[PDB]
């Protein structure tokens, strides 16, 4: 017993593992070059959607999850924030009432849900412009978040999940972390990438 203690996260190689394994599978479908281009496009899409949104959200929110219900038993919070990013924002398929009802049914305190919804909104408005405009300039809090987001969702109908998928960021270009203004802070991460290839003779 007690074999090991695995850790599941984005480890600066999930890109490569994904590309490699899927390439290996698809060579038996496409031939070399087609499989190459295919896995390239597949990972690019997966990156620009899932990484850019969900991973940034998870990294931002993890400390608050630990403060509130510090435990391995935070998985319900993770699925909650996932559905928040998907079901409510970018789709307006459900009102805050649904989530709060569901997770108090799942045993989560209400104000916790309200707080998490507030923060995920406060950061998602920074990530995607469309939500930032739909909510406008309102700081979310467990006292005002439910009413505001419920107004926003009911004002709109259910949007097709195509909005949640790709096109949202596709149509609108954004400031890079390689710009002036508020895009001059993070490339440190990418910076390492550069160093890496130089050391590998690349």
């Amino acid at each position: 017993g007690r074999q090991s203690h695995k850790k599941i996260d984005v480890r600066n190689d999930t890109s490569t593992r994904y590309k490699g394994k899927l390439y290996g599978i698809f060579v038996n479908y496409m031939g070399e070059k087609y499989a190459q281009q295919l896995v390239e496009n597949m990972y690019s899409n997966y990156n620009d959607v899932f990484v850019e949104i969900y991973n940034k959200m998870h990294n931002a929110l993890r400390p608050t999850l630990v403060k509130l219900a510090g435990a391995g038993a935070t998985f319900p919070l993770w699925q909650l924030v996932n559905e928040a990013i998907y079901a409510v924002y970018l789709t307006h398929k459900e009102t805050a009432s649904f989530l709060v009802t569901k997770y108090v049914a799942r045993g989560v305190p209400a104000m916790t849900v309200k707080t998490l919804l507030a923060e995920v909104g406060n950061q998602l408005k920074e990530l995607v412009p469309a939500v930032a405009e739909q909510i406008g300039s309102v700081t979310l809090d467990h006292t005002n978040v439910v009413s505001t987001v419920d107004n926003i969702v009911t004002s709109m109908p259910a949007l097709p999940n195509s909005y949640a998928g790709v096109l949202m960021k596709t149509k609108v270009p954004t400031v890079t972390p390689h710009y002036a203004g508020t895009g001059t802070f993070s490339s440190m991460e990418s910076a390492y990438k550069a160093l890496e290839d130089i050391e590998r003779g690349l």
């Binding site: 599978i25 060579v27 038996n28 479908y29 398929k93 649904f98 009802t101 569901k102 997770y103 049914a105």
Partner: protein
């Protein structure tokens, strides 16, 4: 893919395509040598067979749901589009609520799919005789719900 009513053809199609996927999976790069050996070939064949069997056994409920939704559409003269839409709705309600009961009440999903169908819920339809008829979505929604509970014997 285009709409095709389920038949044994679908079973065999899924079977063979799973054969291709598995032979791709095992020999991650050495697909050819793996393809040449008949033993791993038998193994992959049996695996794809088992997987097809699994997928079949976990689809009959959705099949019955689509059946009863088709019946309801026929008795209420609903065009194919909304037939498929209500099929999907019944599938959703049986999955998330009837079988697993995720923590959400019925009428909540009811109003959710109501907003899904709005534009607002009493659509007027012209039958083949030219007699226009109107139907409330929420009513026929609530109709198939109870009828569905009759199916599972809830």
């Amino acid at each position: 893919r285009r709409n095709r009513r389920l038949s044994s053809a679908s079973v065999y199609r899924y079977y063979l395509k799973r054969i291709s996927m598995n032979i791709g999976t095992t020999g991650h790069v050495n697909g050819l040598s793996i393809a040449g050996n008949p033993e791993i070939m038998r193994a992959i064949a049996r695996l794809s067979e088992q997987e097809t069997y699994n997928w079949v056994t976990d689809y009959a409920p959705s099949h019955l749901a689509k059946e009863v939704v088709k019946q309801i559409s026929g008795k209420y003269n609903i065009p194919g589009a909304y037939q498929g839409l209500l099929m999907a709705f019944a599938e959703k309600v049986l999955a998330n609520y009837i079988l697993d009961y995720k923590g959400e009440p019925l009428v909540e999903i009811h109003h959710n799919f109501l907003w899904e169908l709005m534009q607002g819920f009493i659509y007027t339809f012209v039958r083949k005789d030219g007699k226009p008829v109107t139907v409330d979505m929420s009513k026929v929604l609530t109709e198939i719900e109870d009828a569905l509970f009759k199916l599972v014997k809830k």
